[PDB]
Amino acid sequence: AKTRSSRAGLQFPVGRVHRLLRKGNYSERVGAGAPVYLAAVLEYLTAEIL
DNA sequence: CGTACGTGCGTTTAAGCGGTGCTAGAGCTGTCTACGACCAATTGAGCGGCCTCGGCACCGGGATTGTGAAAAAAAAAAGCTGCA
Ligand SMILES: [Ca+2]
């Protein structure tokens, strides 16, 4: 087993983000690509501030 | 005190109206399946707890920056003399 973060080449937790989406009342369903996309965006922004 | 705006003329222009004519593309129905919820077993990433140790908070003291008053350099602006 290796994390979805490592598959996507990311530091931010794709698995955590996907759960937050499922548990945050945004939609009924969540695509696999979504949390990957999002995590990456939050990491980019984070990197740009740091 | 100067002229940029508001006013009220005429002159020009194209917005709006009503109508026709085409067709892109919105928007629908039905069929199919790939893609996500769901579950359960698995099990590592991430948590709380805790201990070091080096960066930052603080201090004192000297170096530098910056303000401001009053005293020079200079510029300037009037009164005085002669003046072709
Ligand atoms: Ca910790």
Swiss-Prot record:
Molecular function terms from GO: DNA binding; protein heterodimerization activity; structural constituent of chromatin
Entry annotated with the keyword Acetylation: yes
Cellular component terms per the entry's GO annotation: CENP-A containing nucleosome; extracellular exosome; nucleosome; nucleus
PTM characteristics: It is involved in the initiation of both imprinted and random X inactivation. Ubiquitinated H2A is enriched in inactive X chromosome chromatin. Ubiquitination of H2A functions downstream of methylation of 'Lys-27' of histone H3 (H3K27me). H2AK119Ub by RNF2/RING2 can also be induced by ultraviolet and may be involved in DNA repair. It is present at 35S ribosomal DNA locus and impairs binding of the FACT complex.
Cross-link (Glycyl lysine isopeptide (Lys-Gly) (interchain with G-Cter in ubiquitin)): K2
Protein location: Nucleus; Chromosome
Main function: Core component of nucleosome. Nucleosomes wrap and compact DNA into chromatin, limiting DNA accessibility to the cellular machineries which require DNA as a template. Histones thereby play a central role in transcription regulation, DNA repair, DNA replication and chromosomal stability. DNA accessibility is regulated via a complex set of post-translational modifications of histones, also called histone code, and nucleosome remodeling.
Subunit structure: The nucleosome is a histone octamer containing two molecules each of H2A, H2B, H3 and H4 assembled in one H3-H4 heterotetramer and two H2A-H2B heterodimers. The octamer wraps approximately 147 bp of DNA.
Family as reported in the entry's similarity comment: Belongs to the histone H2A family.
Listed name of the protein: Histone H2A type 1-B/E
Species annotation: Homo sapiens (Human)
